[PDB]
């Protein structure tokens, strides 16, 4: 019950039941852990990257990527994703 199938460095029982990241190793989830400020992560043990973004469920929870990523995207279910539209500020009309 301590074996990793999708090889995301998170054993299946951890991903299935619950886990957080301590000292960059995957430890199982305790409710007293939320005191210091850790978060409860849970993901698909059948997928390298559960959210679908190029980053693996480990990398997301670990926070070991581009640090400019918004922190909520560390949840292996909140996809890291840039959403870009183009707004307009000045509207100039002429006849030239």
């Amino acid at each position: 019950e301590d074996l990793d199938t999708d090889n995301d460095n998170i054993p299946d029982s951890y991903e299935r039941n619950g886990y957080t990241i301590k000292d960059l190793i995957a430890v199982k989830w305790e409710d007293s852990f939320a005191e210091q400020g850790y978060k409860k992560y849970v993901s698909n043990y059948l997928e390298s990257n559960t959210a679908g973004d190029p980053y693996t469920d480990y990398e997301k929870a670990s926070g070991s990527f581009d640090k400019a990523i918004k922190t909520e995207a560390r949840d292996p279910l909140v996809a890291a994703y840039p959403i870009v539209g183009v707004g307009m500020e000045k509207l100039i009309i002429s006849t030239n």
């Binding site: 990241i21 301590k22 000292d23 960059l24 210091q36 400020g37 850790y38 670990s62 926070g63 581009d66 640090k67 400019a68 922190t71």
Partner: protein
């Protein structure tokens, strides 16, 4: 052109500054191409504070990593402001006051 005569100032805003840095290749060869600063720019600004110095002959700006107490898994050291300044500019403590060279 009439807005200059009232004395309003022309600003020279300059955005993104694409460039390169120099790494030491596995042959002792420093290489500049492929080492895009703009790759790491986004990272650094996210976890840091911005420190500038006036020094009325030439200015100095630095970036220094912050702690973000709200994360237990960020084992980065913790710094007071005054501590950051002396490392960001190589300042000295002549008397507990901080001195740049003699300033």
């Amino acid at each position: 052109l009439k807005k200059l005569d009232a004395g309003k100032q022309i600003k020279l805003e300059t955005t993104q500054v694409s460039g390169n840095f120099g790494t030491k290749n596995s042959s002792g060869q420093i290489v500049t191409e492929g080492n895009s600063w703009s790759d790491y720019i986004s990272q650094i600004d996210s976890i840091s504070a911005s420190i500038i110095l006036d020094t009325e002959n030439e200015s100095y700006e630095r970036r220094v990593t912050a702690k973000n107490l709200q994360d237990p898994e960020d084992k980065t050291p913790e710094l007071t402001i005054g501590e950051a300044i002396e490392k960001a500019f190589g300042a000295t403590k002549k008397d507990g006051l901080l001195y740049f060279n003699d300033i």
